[model samples]
Structures are given as structure tokens and as C-alpha cells.
Target chain A: SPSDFLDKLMGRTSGYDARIRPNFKGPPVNVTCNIFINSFGSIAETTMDYRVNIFLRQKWNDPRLAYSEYPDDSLDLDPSMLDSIWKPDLFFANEKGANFHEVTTDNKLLRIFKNGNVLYSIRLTLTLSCPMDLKNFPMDVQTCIMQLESFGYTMNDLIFEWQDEAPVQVAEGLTLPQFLLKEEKDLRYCTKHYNTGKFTCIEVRFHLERQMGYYLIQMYIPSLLIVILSWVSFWINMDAAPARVALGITTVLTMTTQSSGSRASLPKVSYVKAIDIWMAVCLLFVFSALLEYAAVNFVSRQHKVFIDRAKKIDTISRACFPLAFLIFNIFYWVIYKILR
Target chain B: SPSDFLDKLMGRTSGYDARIRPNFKGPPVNVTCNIFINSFGSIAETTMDYRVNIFLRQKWNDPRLAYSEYPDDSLDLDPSMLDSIWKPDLFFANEKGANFHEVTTDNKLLRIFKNGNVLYSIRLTLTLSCPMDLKNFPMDVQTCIMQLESFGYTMNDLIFEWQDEAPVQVAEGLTLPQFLLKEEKDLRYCTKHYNTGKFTCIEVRFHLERQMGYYLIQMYIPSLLIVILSWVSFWINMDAAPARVALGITTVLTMTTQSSGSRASLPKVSYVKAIDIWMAVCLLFVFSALLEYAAVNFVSRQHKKVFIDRAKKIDTISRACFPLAFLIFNIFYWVIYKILRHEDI
Candidate 1:
């Protein structure tokens, strides 16, 4: 009968160990990226927001109680081996936060993305909890290394993915061969103490990179499409401003819906995106549509183009547009390139 | 020998509850935005970027184990009482996941930000621990709801603060308000799930509201001073683009640094912050200064009117900034004002 009870006790002990006890490991590294673009206006004022995220998974490790309390007592209590949810006084030195004190390693740094209007930063942290047992009265003789390995968590290698897309004409620029781009964000985990305990790593840093090469390209593709090419409909002497406004607004509205639908697959984000910039640039094209919205009341060219277009295009004037944009951009890249 | 054995029945139990537990509150929220204006010459294009994060923090209400199993040989545990971690045995109750297991009234949404570049979407989930005491017998209850008050956990309600450092401007007949002018973010907290243990009130949610206009005034002022005002230094003789460049550069640098340093007092965040956007905006004023540096090298007679004259007059630009901002902002609001005049989308 005692042997039957013993069998039940051991079976119970092993069940808790195999089932209740947590096994340690890191998170599966799955990465995905998508991009979209919309034009704000005919003159180009797109909102390009770059977004990236690094998701991590790790384990909670706890220790097992295993030691003999009495050698001579006939009660035969393997007090150290007892598996209660509570940490009985018998195994305090070895059961709780024991080997974690041996930790010594600084966390890593990560750079998210560096480009104009594209903001970037990254974070990383380590959570350690190893539940196992190591008690032989004289812990000095026991090989605690195995218990310690359970102490240190693994953060398998990091994975990265990035994509940038905009309207065909809007995405045009100084070109280069296209190939799969692999950018790694390997931020070291915060060791035991440095971790805010809140997270292994949480940071925010900003830097911008600008050069003349991309700017040096003929930058008219999207602008021409919106401000000029799209305006070709205007050149047709379309009688109704409502019809012209309909065409302009329809283009922008369609682009907005298309962009929103594509972004539908993504996690909701707080700020604007790189694609949003493209769409906003496309949306601004809607102002030309809005101008048409206003032009509907007018009867002729002298009335519409000079009166209405003059009033609003200055809202994005040729005078303000050039220095407000071109020369300043040239000056920017010149200083930027020379500084580098 | 029995007396020596008795000595091992030692130390006190660690009944401290909140010392180690998970809760529902969180730290502050942070957001950052960056924009490249006039990236290409004729293409006075403006593209922006943004990042945001809000933490959830929780504190245990019970200073001690509120409900626990004291040592007893009789060992008859109550099924409803939760003390230790538990992995619910789905087979034990077919009625649980069937008719009663409905995900009802999940109307909570994390409001992202007020107008500008993007629309936001959000999701929230809960973490469940494993069943520990199931196999172990003669112990405690199946689950433990640490005496969490009716309400616990901080849901950091974060809103992107819109600061308009550049102020509003009147040029053409239209008034243009500079977007992405300042970096500032606001945080608020409310309880959704108090983790009230029983199935009674296990769910929580909050409605979001954003304050966009207040911040627009905050960030716009500085942008005007830096970008449009810095244009004034161009009035100086073309003698030293280098010296004038130094003044403009340092001012822009100091303002930018102060803008960033200001955040040191706030909580660290996963995304760029509202203030960070302001810093980026201020940094671009340096871009405007750089243009002035280049424009210094090219001057004509009419340029005097554009330079010395425009600089002097623009100093008065701040006074009417808000009025100008209101005019342009109406493009979004008042047009709707007119639309609502006729009940439709």
C-alpha cells in the first residue's frame, strides 16, 4: 500500500514538473512590410511616414524544489522535492532569483530608418525566469551550470523587412537597380539590472540623411501628371467646373480609398505614414479639384483660370513654391552632402 | 536529534502580494513626426512620418495575500475561489464556451490623433497564466485574484499634441497654417478591465477624444520665428554668407536641442513624440537658413525689397498668426460647416 502511495506521489511530482513548469525559449521572428502612396496636390506635398516594429517573445522560468531535509527520520519526507505552488522555506537559497545575480552584459543599439520625413527608432529587452531545482545540502558540489543555462534566456537572431511604394509617377526619382533589401535591427537586450524592468530596451532617437543625387533627378513625373498631365483635361475646355472638379476630386478620392484599403492590412498606427504622404500629395491634387469646385460658378476662362486659379495656386504659388522648395532643397542637399 | 530536526521548520512565508504581479496601468504616451518640405526644387513637396506608443500599468490592491489556503489536512478546496495560476479544463464545462462564451460589448478604441496625415486603428488582448496546482494535491485554491480594487491598471490615454511653432502666415489672399510645427503629446488614463476575477465584469473600454487646436498655437510660433524670420538675416550684406550662416545655424541648433532635451523629463516611448515632431520642424528651419546661405550668393536690386524690407515687415508676422491659421483650418472644418448646412456626407 505504501508503494502504491509512493507511485502516486512520484507520478504527481513528475506531472507538475513536466506540465506546470515553464520551458524557456525566444519568440518566433516573423517580419512583414507594405507601402502605398497618394498625391496631395498637383504641385506635390505628400506625407511620407515610415513605420517599423520589432516584436519579441520570451519565457518565464521558475525553479523546482529538490533536497532531502531529514536522513534519520522514518517519515521519509523528500521535503526538497515537494512541488507546491508556494516556496516553502526549505529551498529559499536555491529556488528564487538565484543565478540571475551572475548576469553581466550591456544591451544593444538599433537604428530604425534614416531618410527625409521618414522617422525611425527601435527597442529591446530581456525577461528572465527559470524554474528548476538544484539542492544537495552542500550546493557547492552540485553543478549549477545547468540551472544557470536555464537562467539565461535566448533571443534568437533578429529579422528585418522594409518596403516603400507610392503612385507610379510619384515614386519616380534618381534610380538604382532594385533588389531585395535586408536591414537588420540587432538591439542588445538589457541585462538584469539596467532593464527598466518595464522593458529590456525602449528608446527614441532621430537623425535625417539628405543628398543631392536623388534631388538631381528630373523631378517632374508626378508633378507633371497632377499639375500638368491631369490638367490636360482642363485644357479640353470642359464647360462645367463641376465636371472638371468631379474629375479632379474623383482622382484624389479614388487614390485615397485605394491607399486606405491597402493600409487596411496593417496594425492601426498613431501618426501619418510614408504612404500617407504620397496620398496627401495626391489629395492636394484635389485642391485643383476644389478650384474646379469653385470654378463651377464661373462662366469662362478669364473668369475661372485668372480669377480662381490665381487666388488659390498662390496658396501654392510659383514664387513661394520654388524657393520654398527647390533652392532650399538644393541648399539642403549641398550642405548635407558637404557635411558628410 | 528530534530537536535538531525541528530547527529546519524555518523562515516565514513570503505572503507579499504586489511585490511581484501583473497589473493594468501604464506609463505615458509618446509620438514623433518628421517632414521633408521642398525636397525637390519645383516640387515644393512635403512628406511626413510619425510614431507613437502608450504603456499600460497596473498595481495590485491587496498588500497581502487577500485569499489563500492555510495549511489543513481536510483539504476540500472551493472551485469558485482562485488562488494559484490555472489552465482552465475546457472539458469540465461544455456550457462555458458554448452559450455563455460570447465576446460581447468590446467597444474600446485607442484614439490616435487629430487630423493631418493618418487615420488610426487599434487592438487589445489579455494574458492568461498556466494551471499550476492541478496535478499537485493537498495545496491551495485553483486561481488567485490578488485583491485588485474594483478598478486597477492605467490605460495611458494618449493624444498627439499639435504645436504650431511656425505661426500662421498671410501671403496671397489665403492664409496657410504650417503643419508639423511642434512636437507635443498628451496622456490620460481610465480603467477598462479591473480584472475583477469573477465573470461579472471582466471587460473594460474607453472612448477617445483629441485636442488638436490648442497645440496648433503652441508649435506654430517657433516655426515662424525660425523659418520665416531667419529669412531676415539675408538682409545683411552678401559680405559673409559664412558669418550670417553661423548665427542662423547656431540659433536653429539651440532651439532644436532644447526641443529634444525638453523630452528628457517625459516618459520614454516606443514611437516618435509630439515634441520630437516639433524638434524636426525646428531643425528644418535650419534648412530654410541654408537656403538663405545660398541665396546670399545671388542678389539683385529687387532682392533688397525681398530681403531688408520683407524681413522688417515679417517681424510683425506673429501678431496676426492665429487669425491666419483659423482661415486655412476652416478648409477642413467650415467646409463641413457648410455641408452640414445641408444634411449629408
Candidate 2:
């Protein structure tokens, strides 16, 4: 009989509507919700995608779909039956991709208990928009929020509350190659009254702090080594113009490549992120090394006696360059981190 | 009975079904499509949105809902008539946001002609993801594509052919404050047979070249002025140690800020762009100028008579050197640009 009823539902029979109305038989059904994060796939400049499994439990008091009116204690309904029942039209407001999810299993949309309760379990991959601040970029900590809200009903007609104290439960052995988990929390949208009444919303925030290890290995070290390599040109004989000029060109070009390679993974933003400042200084250092050779080469070419004077400047710079860089880092961090 | 039919449709009745099958209809529908871009909205690093009106005209020969079979020659049907007909589920492959369209005018999903043809028109805003190559960035040329492909049906069942050579009509006063339209043309995806059948797709590409006016004023001219500003210390008397040192530090710091400001509008790329090379050279010029003052200042602070020698050497060298570097750069910038430009393609 229930199968016939489902056939009727699927056959588009007359006077049959499944969309929830303002007036219902009893009280509004309470639905408990939770999310399991399987992995943190990627965190782009403005958006991020992750693998997750959502779990929902709600009771169904509709007289038509009552389990006692069924043949079995627990009857598994067709995934399409989700459309006929009073399932919450939960959606992610900041989603940039498709609203539907991919099923990894048999894709059972919902399970009905003889007590008229439904357990809806779904495995999905979702993409959500993440607003990030790159003031500390490589060392930055970002919180990406996955917000869920009801599209049509208000708080009075449909209430949404967190199923757990800490809403998002991360899967075991979940790890991101470039980031470390800092914290996680469940939050809800504050009291706001729309035309329909107070709209209910909840969110799970994943706080991911970047692991500076990747940048340190890939960016920080290579740049520093290039700065030092450019310094090797300082000890070369001034008359050996070929050697010094060759070194100058090589280092400048190398630094340029390094700067470009490092920034490729980052987003293009209109403001100066921390990495911008670092690369700028590194380029200046390498270029400064090249310019020093020009000054030395120029002065010594005319007066061989001026070799000592050129040497004197190089001697001072050999000590001054490294110290200046050290001082700059100290002040840069102190200012950007503390004062700014 | 008509109300009962409507109820049966909404109620998901056991017998009545509107979903089209392989056996239905006299022939597969041939739809004519065209689009008009009204306004281009914000373009982000990853996505861009634009307002457009799409037109589709096709013949719907289903006798079940044919107008000639009805009471009148024409019939006004609800939007749900689309579920029962054969139509292409065209979608933008790179769409980033919602797939639904906004109804700017009358929200009619299908229009039935007396001869069983349907003409569907809609106006909406769409955001699509675009992969940009910032090699030339501010002054770069970009090609953004809008692709349309059927979601369910493939080539054998539903082939997407262009209605015209250029079906997209531009806006009356279309303007991109930052970029100029270079070209727009229709292209199709390569032939591919899916599990079901061959998948056919078509796209319209908009090639845009940026206007260099903004960068010339904001980046180029200012940085050159700063380089020349740093040369002012070379003219100052060498004995004025404090004056020259202050000028040297000021220029270096100022050059750093200028470099940052110029790159702020650019995307963080992995390879050196034309502008990156240009900015680096400007920064080098400014920095070298400051270092010149540093050498001149250090030598003057020591030997009193050395001030005359140091000052004389710097005075001659600075004047010769700035122009020398400028000449070298004109040659240097071009060589790398030419080679790098070829490599980027």
C-alpha cells in the first residue's frame, strides 16, 4: 500500500503537494544536525572546498507517512521521497559551486523509523567562500565558516539549533599538507527578523593556521641564499669586470625567478600581503649587491689607486649588508605584528 | 478535470508522468539560440559576473500539449510545461555561483507557438570562473570564455551548433574602465564521445586588452621620478653628512613603498612578469642611487681632503652613471621581455 502511495507520489497525482505549509498538524518538528569533516582539501584566496558527511535526525508526525500505517517497523524510502516529505531545505548561503552533493554510498536520502522519526545521512563534497586576511600570509591563521540556514521558514515554523556543543567533528587522521588545525567552534546567526519572522541559522567554523614550514623551506630559505650568493661577487677583483658583471646579472635574474615562482600559488589581491614585503626587500638586496659592483667597477677603471677606496666601500658593505637585513627583519616584524 | 490534472501533476500521481522519453515526439527539437550582453559586472581574480539576455526558439511537436489539439490555436501554459518537453539543459561549465536566472520581465519558461514551436527568453546575471594569465597583467591581454553544454543529452541526441557566426550582441554603451575589447568569436569544444554518446559544447570568447594609461601614471612615471629624486643627494655637498645620509635612507624607504604600491594591483604570480621586471629595475635604480650617496658619505666622513676627491669622483660618476644605467636598461628590459614573452605563450 505504501509502495502504491509512493507510486502515486512519483506519478504526480492530483492535489498532492509536499512543500511545507505555514500551518501543520502538531508542533514544528525538531531536527538535530551534525557535520563530519573528512579532509581540508584546499583553501583558495576567496573560496575553499572540503570533503564532509552530514547527519540529520528529525521526527515525522505526518498522518500519511506514519510507520504504523506501514508494513514494517523501519521502512527505507526512495531518495526522491525526500522531496515529498517535510525535509528541511537546508542550504549553504556562501556556496559558490553546485548546491547538490555527490553520494559515495547507495545514496539513501532518508530512513524512516516506526516512531515516525527520520535519519538522513549524506556524504558530500562542498565548496564554501572563505574571506582571508593575508597580512601575515604564510604565517596567517584563517577561519572558514560553513553556514547552514533555512530558505523559506522562520524560527517559529522551523527551528535550527546545533546538535552538538562543538558542531563540526573532524575525522581521525585528517591532515592538510600546508596547514595545521588551530581550533573549531559552532556558532549561530544572531537574532534578526526578516519579513517571514525571525530566520534561524547556524554555522561551523574551522580555524586553520598555516604551517610556516612550507614557506620557510620553499621561499624564506631560497631568498636568503640568493642574497648571500649575490654577496660573493663583492670579493672578486674589481679589474675582473667580466666576473663581477656576470655574477650581478645571474643573481638579479635568479631572484626575479624566485619571486615569481613563490607567488604563483597565492591569490592576486590589491593590497600588500606580507610576502610582497619580503620579496621586495630580497630583490632590493640582490640588486643593491649588483649596483655596488657597478660603483666599484667604475671607480677602479680610471684610477688603479682608487682600488683601495673601492675596496674600503666593499669592506664596509660586506659587514653592513647582513646587519642591515637582520635589523630590517626585526623592525619589520615588530611593526607589522605589534604596532600595525 | 483540468484542476484534477493540475493536482495530479503536483501530487506526483502514480500514473501521470511528464518526463520525456526516447520514443516521444516527431523529431528532436532544433533550438536557435542567441545572447546579448547588457553589462559586465565585477571581475574577481577567479570569477566574473555579467548581465545577459538569452533567446531560444524551438519547435515543440508533442501532440499531448499541442495547441491545435487544444480548444484554441494558442495556449498559455505554466512554467512547469518545461518538465514535459524536450529541451537542452544548457549550463555554463565554469559557473561559480547559482545556476538559476533572475526574471527581469515576465517569468515565462516556455512559449508555445500555433505550429507547436516554443520560444523561451530570459534575462539574468551569471558569474563564471575564468583562468587568467597575468604574464602581461595591467597591460596584458586576456580571453574569458562562456561555455554552454547540455547537461543530460549528448551529441547524438542533442547537438549544440551555433545559430550564427557571432550570436552574441554587445551592449550599446559597453565599457570596461580598465580593459578594451579586442575580439569575440564562437568556438566549439573538441569532439569527444562520452559513455552515453558524444558530448558537444560551444563557447564564445571575449578577448580583452588592458589600457596602459592607468599604469603609466600610477606606476611608471612615479617610479622614474623617485629614481631621479634619489639622484638629488649626488648633487648635495659631500661634507653635509647628515643631509646625504637622511636623503639616502629616505629614498631607499620611499623606493620600497613605491614598489609595494605598484604590485598591489597584480596577482601574486610565480614567474617574472613584464611589470615585475620593470619595477625591479626602477627599484634597483633608486637603491643604487642611495648606495652611491652611502659610499660618498662614508668616504667624506673620514679624510677631510678625501671629501674633495670623493665629491669630485661621485659628481662625475653619478652624472655619467645614471644615464649609463638608463641606456643599459632600455636594452636589458627589451631582451628579457622578448624572450620571456615568447616563452609565456
| Per-prediction DockQ | 0.02, 0.05
Q: After superposition, how far is residue A25 of candidate 2 from its true place, in Å?
A: 27
Q: Specify the highest-TM-score model's number.
A: 2
- Report, in order, each candidate's fnat: 0.00, 0.00
Residue B58 in model 1: lDDT: 16
lDDT of 2 by residue, B1-345 (tens): 545544443235523344332223224444466666777746655222333333423333444333333355554556564444444445554444333343563444566566655566555456554556666655566677777655344454455666654577776777876777655554666444422245567677887667878777877777667666766666776555455545544564455456545554554444455676676676666556655654554454455255768667877778678877776886776665555553342
Cα-based lDDT at residue B341, candidate 2: 54
TM-score of each: 0.24, 0.55
Q: Give candidate 1 misplaced runs (Cα > 4 Å).
A: A1-340, B1-201, B207-221, B231-247, B262-278, B298-345
lDDT of 1 by residue, B229-281 (tens): 45566445444444554555445544543553444333222234444544554
